Amino acid sequence: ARGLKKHLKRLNAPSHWMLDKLGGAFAPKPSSGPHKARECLPLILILRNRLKYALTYREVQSILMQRHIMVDGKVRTDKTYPAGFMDIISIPKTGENYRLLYDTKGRFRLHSVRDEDAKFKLCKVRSVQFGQKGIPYLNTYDGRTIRYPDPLIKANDTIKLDLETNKIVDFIKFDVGNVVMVTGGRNTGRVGVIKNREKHKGTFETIHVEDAQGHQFATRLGNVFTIGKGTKPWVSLPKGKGIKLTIIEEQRKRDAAAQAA
């Protein structure tokens, strides 16, 4: 190709969008933004698909041009805007607030939060280093660059960021013994506790994690995102508290729930 591609064909769209294969030839093609477009959830799907607030393409545009939807504290009128993990979507007109979090099956879910727990987010640091005139600054994994961080915050750690003041308010030091929610691979959605980290010089670091219900698993460093200090997490969990289960467990769940109805 002689340049950038602007269409996303529906069969090539991410599998966790759950777009149906006969519903057209194209998919929304998330615009560039603070998330990598293969791990984001555009606003078209948040409004039209999940929340069923709109029935068509153009209805979503009619919603956005009216400045209702607010993403992480600012009003975003772009229709394919790449909202992502741990963002907040707010509709003040309905006074309703959602944190984007994973479910155990690896798909984004809009977990309702309160207005208290919507003025802040958590963000993992990509790196820390100096800038022009010796000023230190840190990178997040969603584009944000903060200058003059606490000189302790190192790479791969977590920070709490108030949306009002837009500065840090606390942080978690990435290390063994903290709760972490996996954001990639087959284990995405599963929360757990860091039990082991094994280094490998020249390759990816691997993390070994143990769920609260005992199930043990592992991932690589880039796919782990600490939530809280100690066993208690700092943010709300969705319908399942990040606990993966076998297919037989949910078969039992359906049939056992089929006797009360």
Partner 1 sequence: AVTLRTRKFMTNRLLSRKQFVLEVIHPGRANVSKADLKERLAKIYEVKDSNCIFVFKFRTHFGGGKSTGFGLIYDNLEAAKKFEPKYRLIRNGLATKVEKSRKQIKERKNRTK
Partner 2 sequence: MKLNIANPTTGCQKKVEIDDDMKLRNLYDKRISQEVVGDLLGEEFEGYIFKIMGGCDKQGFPMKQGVLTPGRVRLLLHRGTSCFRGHGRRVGERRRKSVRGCIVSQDLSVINLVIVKKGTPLTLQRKRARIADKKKRIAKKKSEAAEYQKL
Q: By the criterion CB under 8 A, which residues form the site for partner 2?
A: 135, 147-148, 150-151
In whole angstroms, what is the distance from residue 77 CA to residue 71 CA? 10
Q: Tell me the two tokens of residue 244.
A: 């993966």
Enumerate long-range contacts of 24-32, CB under 8 Å, 24 or more apart.
28/79, 28/80, 29/80, 30/80, 30/81, 30/82, 31/78, 31/80, 31/81, 31/82, 32/82
Residue whose C-alpha is closest to residue 10's, from 36, 28, 31, 32: 28
* 235 lines the binding site for partner 1 (CB under 8 A): no
Q: Is residue 261 involved in binding partner 1 (CB under 8 A)?
A: no
Query: Residue 252 touches which of Mg ion, partner 1, RNA, none (CB < 5 to 8 A by kind)?
Result: none
> Among 15, 22, 95, 133, which residue interacts with RNA (rule: CB under 7 A)?
133
Pattern 176-195, partner 1, x by CB under 8 A: --------------------
Q: Closest distance between RNA and the C-beta of residue 140, in Å?
A: 8
**Which among partner 2, partner 1, RNA, none contacts residue 151 (Cβ within 5 to 8 A by kind)?**
partner 2
Residue 88 bridge partners (DSSP): 99
Nearer to RNA by Cβ, of 56 and 130: the residue is 130
Per-residue CA distances from 43 to 47, 68, 72 (Å): 6, 12, 13
Kindly tell me which residue out of 4, 11, 55, 261 binds partner 1, with binding defined by CB under 8 A: 55
Between residues 80 and 140, which has the closer beta carbon with respect to Mg ion? 80
Among 14, 16, 34, 229, binds RNA (CB under 7 A): 34
Query: Quick check: 207 and 196 in contact, CB under 8 A?
Result: yes
Residue with tokens 């078209």: 44
User: Does residue 32 interact with RNA by CB under 7 A?
Assistant: yes
Q: Any binding-site annotation on 29?
A: yes
Contact residue for RNA among 114, 201, 232, 239 (CB under 7 A): 201
Judged by CB under 8 A, the residue of 2, 3, 94, 239 near partner 1 is: 94
In the complex, minimum distance from the CB of residue 20 to RNA, in angstroms, rounded to a whole number: 15
Phi/psi of residue 58, nearest 5 degrees: -70, -25
Binding mask 56-95 for RNA (x = CB under 7 A): ------------------x---x--xx-------------
Least distance from partner 1 to the Cβ atom of residue 96, Å: 10
Contact by Cβ (8 Å): 233, 252:
no
Q: How far is the CB of 214 from Mg ion (least distance, A)?
A: 44
* Distance in angstroms (rounded) separating the CA atoms of residues 236 and 63: 28
DSSP letter, residue 197: E
Q: Which residues contact 79 (CB under 8 A, 6 or more apart)?
A: 28, 42, 43, 44, 60, 61, 64
Contact 53, 63 (CB under 8 A): yes
Q: List, as residue ranges, the binding site for Mg(2+).
A: 29
Binding site for partner 1 (CB under 8 A): 52-55, 58-59, 62-63, 66, 68, 91, 93-94
